[PDB]
Design a protein around this nucleic acid. Structure first.
Length: 119
RNA sequence: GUUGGUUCUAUUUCUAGGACCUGAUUAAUAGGGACGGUCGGGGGCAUCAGUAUUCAAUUGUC
């Protein structure tokens, strides 16, 4: 119903607010809500530039369903593929920024305590 | 059922996946073993005691 109201709807500002809310969303219920909001969002990419910031990041039966959701978001385009490649480079840049923060900070045994406590 | 490295996280918190750095019935009014308080002219060594016996000394009496 809220996606129906968002399609019925500061138009571009509220659309960016909805895309920011979907990125803040993206446990199984919230992940299904994120896939539903991405399906309600999918111009084809000129409004969806600021909406694939997390749906491509996800591209454990809930994890298998999330992988099916990522395949659904990838199937459902030249400008969209260009924005997706730029967003992949931006996620690589964010990984570089997090790695730079970690390398400047350097949980030595705590970096393996999670795996030693999991198995 | 003991190390190092990868990526994902929003208001440094706090996070997800690799490698690599010891086997399986019951517990007999069968058994041996441990433990507890014991028990016995049981044994070995060391020690203590007894009054006899023998010997010696000192006497006493015939």
């Amino acid at each position: 119903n809220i996606s129906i109201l968002w399609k019925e709807q500061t138009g571009e500002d509220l659309k960016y607010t909805t895309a920011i809310d979907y990125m803040v969303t993206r446990g199984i219920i919230r992940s299904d809500e994120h896939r539903m909001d991405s399906f309600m969002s999918k111009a084809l990419l000129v409004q969806v530039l600021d909406e694939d910031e997390v749906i491509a990041e996800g591209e454990y039966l809930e994890t298998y369903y999330s992988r099916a959701v990522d395949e659904e978001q990838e199937e459902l385009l030249e400008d969209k593929l260009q924005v997706s490649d730029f967003t992949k480079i931006y996620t690589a840049v964010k990984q570089t920024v997090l790695e730079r923060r970690k390398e400047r900070r350097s949980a030595d045994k705590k970096l393996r305590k999670h795996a030693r406590s999991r198995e």
